[PDB]
Amino acid sequence: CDLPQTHNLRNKRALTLLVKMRRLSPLSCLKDRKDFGFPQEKVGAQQIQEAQAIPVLSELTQQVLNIFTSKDSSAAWNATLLDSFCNEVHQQLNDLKACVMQQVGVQESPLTQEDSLLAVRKYFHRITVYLREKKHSPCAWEVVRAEVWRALSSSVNLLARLSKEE
């Protein structure tokens, strides 16, 4: 992608705000754990190139933003941290979307993109269903925050890996 400036430190700011956002000990929520089927297989650099990664990461960033800007989110988390977290994430999403624009009809491997985009969407759909069935309980929100932390951390590590392989 041709961006004026990449802002990697936004990723560090976002992830550490998310870590800081935690309110409960997950040791209090062990029974609320759930395997969401994070699609590692379809977000790994051993095959995925940056051309496929961009739009998939734009989607993950949008889904993350959708969860933390929701009606129920502002009651669940500290507003100061939450507002800062969404500020960082929204800007990264702006940047990712701009890249997605640049590659409209010139999509490389549209198949693996769409297959990845769908696996990501299903994953977050399972997360949101989980949270609704749990009535947005404090433990369910922790399980979700932790999972999102893991999804973002995997994306950041992937981006780091891809920038090394060049």
């Binding site: 004026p4 400036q5 802002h7 990697n8 430190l9 560090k12 992830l15 550490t16 705000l17 870590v19 800081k20 935690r22 000990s25 997950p26 040791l27 929520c29 754990r33 395997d35 994070f38 590692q40 739009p55 734009s58 989607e59 949008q62 800007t69 929701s70 009606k71 502002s74 507003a79 100061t80 507002d83 800062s84 969404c86 500020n87 929204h90 800007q91 702006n94 997605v100 549209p110 198949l111 769409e114 297959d115 985009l117 769908l118 969407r121 299903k122 759909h125 399980v143 932790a146 999972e147 932390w149 893991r150 951390s153 995997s154 950041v156 590590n157 780091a160």
Partner: protein
């Protein structure tokens, strides 16, 4: 590729089938269902929303024609058309009220081919923050400059954005400052660029004489270049007993005691990041210059012995790992 497009269609069909009856009853069965969305809004500020299928990353390439018509209807109690409440094909509310947070909308996209897709849009109130603090460390990307974002806006289709520093209007002439959309770029950054930056976003609606104005604030602190070194601390092994739990903690210590300056995670023998999973899980705690990741084994079985776990600390300045081996005590 045909399998994938089929799975996508099925995905949105399932989502349609899982809607409440109070939602699905408004849908035209001749139309594809294109999803739902619940957007943020602030009382006393303008609000706008796109029709979900248009914005959806899975369906965008399906309804991407310049000659599409988009209709907006209020649903819920009655079913009413929208005239004043549309701007540039988007739902538009010039002054959001408590009553709006209870209203929801059906948008319909009609293509020239005579096909259609629908979405449902809700909104919820969200106090917009006051000032958000931002820190720029000199030496990050000084030649590009500092990008200040005019805050999260709940409505698009603004005509003008104006920036103030410490309540003084900034002269935007491409020297010290330039603008790009909702961004203010501060060139040749220096410590004195620290301050209060307010942006004023101007909206025009014919049904209103003066301007609708939305305001956001960032408190910018520019700091000197920092030493971002850190050290990782992790016992080389974890002594376990078959049929018992165990835990081990990896600690990152910031050399300059910088707060929240290290990203930490645990990874299993296969390279994957460990979360709140079954069998092995991870919990992070951060305070001052110390970040800890604790790894938990719920119930050690013989298969675990000799497994190697990797603790990774990184912060874009440095990237370090340490491993630990599961050993039978």
């Amino acid at each position: 590729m045909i399998d994938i497009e089929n799975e996508i269609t099925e995905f949105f069909n399932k989502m349609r089938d899982t809607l409440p009856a109070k939602d699905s009853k408004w849908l035209n069965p001749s139309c594809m269902f294109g999803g739902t969305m619940n957007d943020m809004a602030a009382l006393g500020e303008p609000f706008s929303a796109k029709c979900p299928p248009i914005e959806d990353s899975l369906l965008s390439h399906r309804y991407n024609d310049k000659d599409n018509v988009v209709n907006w209807e209020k649903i819920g109690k009655t079913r009413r058309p929208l005239n004043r409440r549309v701007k540039n094909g988007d739902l538009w509310i010039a002054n959001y009220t408590s009553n709006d947070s209870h209203r929801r909308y059906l948008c319909t996209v009609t293509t020239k081919n005579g096909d259609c897709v629908q979405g449902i849009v809700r909104s919820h109130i969200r106090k917009p923050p006051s000032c958000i603090p931002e820190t720029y460390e000199l030496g990050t990307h000084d030649k590009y400059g500092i990008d200040l974002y005019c805050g999260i806006l709940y409505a698009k289709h603004y005509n003008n954005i104006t920036w103030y520093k410490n309540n003084q209007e900034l002269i935007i002439d491409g020297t010290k400052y330039s603008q790009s959309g909702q961004n203010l770029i501060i060139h040749n950054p220096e410590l004195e660029d620290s301050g209060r930056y307010d942006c004023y976003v101007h909206y025009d609606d014919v049904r209103i004489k003066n301007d609708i104005v939305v305001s956001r604030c960032k408190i910018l602190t520019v700091i000197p270049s920092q030493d971002h070194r850190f050290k990782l601390i992790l016992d080389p092994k974890i002594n376990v007993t078959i049929g018992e739990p165990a835990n081990i903690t990896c600690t990152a210590v910031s050399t300059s005691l910088l707060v929240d300056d290290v990203l930490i995670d645990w990874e299993n023998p296969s390279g994957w990041i460990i979360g709140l999973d079954f069998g092995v899980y991870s919990i992070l705690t951060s305070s001052g210059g110390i970040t800890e990741a604790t790894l938990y084994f719920e119930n050690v079985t013989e298969e675990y012995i000799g497994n190697t776990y990797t603790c990774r600390g990184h912060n874009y300045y440095f990237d370090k790992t340490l491993t630990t081996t599961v050993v039978l005590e």
